[PDB]
Design an enzyme around this catalytic site. Sequence first.
Site: not given
Length: 335
Positions: A27, A29-30, A45, A160
């Site tokens: 998704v 980066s992850v 990640k 987050d």
Amino acid sequence: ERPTFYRQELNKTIWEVPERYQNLSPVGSVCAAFDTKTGLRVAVKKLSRPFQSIIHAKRTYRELRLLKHMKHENVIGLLDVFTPARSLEEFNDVYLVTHLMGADLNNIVKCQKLTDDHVQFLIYQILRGLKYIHSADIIHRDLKPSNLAVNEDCELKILDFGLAVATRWYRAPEIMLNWMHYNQTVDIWSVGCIMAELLTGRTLFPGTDHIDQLKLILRLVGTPGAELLKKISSESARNYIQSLTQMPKMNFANVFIGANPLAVDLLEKMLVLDSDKRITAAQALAHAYFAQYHDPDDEPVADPRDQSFESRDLLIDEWKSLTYDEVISFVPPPL
Ligand SMILES: CCCCCCCCO[C@@H]1O[C@H](CO)[C@@H](O)[C@H](O)[C@H]1O
Ligand SMILES: CCCCCCCCO[C@@H]1O[C@H](CO)[C@@H](O)[C@H](O)[C@H]1O
């Protein structure tokens, strides 16, 4: 102790991870994945260019240290941090793992109708998390429904920060204006926005841009007095907003109809223009709205963090090396 790895390419890069992590799927980066160790689903990640430069390398270092510190029921925690590197020379890649939670406020508020009771529970849990984060000298600047995960047993975690446009809706006004320095109560603003939304099912302030955003806020809370003046942020910002037309303060009881009067009394302490007058997470926790859950001995603060590094002038390989060590020395959460 060293795990067995395996490579694979994933959208323009090689991922090299332990084999307890199966079925990697991006998704970015992850990647999401499944941990055969813990029987749970996880998110992994890989940092890009951790060591691009002196600037990055040191930021990488600070961020990693911050993340391993986070230890609280309502805050995200590291499951795992690993490197395929077997030594420093080949050290260039860092990988992070946490739990992949199940649901977030966004998706549950889209389709279950919460009661006053659900809401108290939910918001209590955010406040509990916020207080911890805040205690750690950290300002989330981006709380919103999609930052707030929950699992089957209704346990909520804030997610987050120090890591990773669909919303200015939850932003404190002072952040709209470019204040350049912030109180932690910025988050408190977001919390009131989220609570309003959980109560009513809908967004409090769905602005379509910065200026429209301010206008909506001003329609509920009222134009401020000459504390406009103490915004030498920008003379032209100041004048700009002085130019706006003026709005009375709305009575919240007449806006949030059918709500628990304790709950309305709380919003009114949270949706206050002056960041100096917003209630803090700690005080919000004691508000009578949470009487059922409040427990002052069970609402823990963060422990002291050593931040000596932040001043030192290091070259890139020194920064890289201090990072390698934090990787090596990560110790996993129990079960
Ligand atoms: C506590 C956080 C988990 C979310 C709970 C999911 C919503 C449950 O369902 C809600 O329950 C109410 C009665 O309890 C009903 O009156 C509501 O109509 C209903 O939407
Ligand atoms: C939308 C028009 C009014 C702007 C909002 C008022 C400013 C919010 O509050 C301000 O925040 C600063 C830190 O963030 C503090 O240093 C200030 O003392 C405080 O007044």
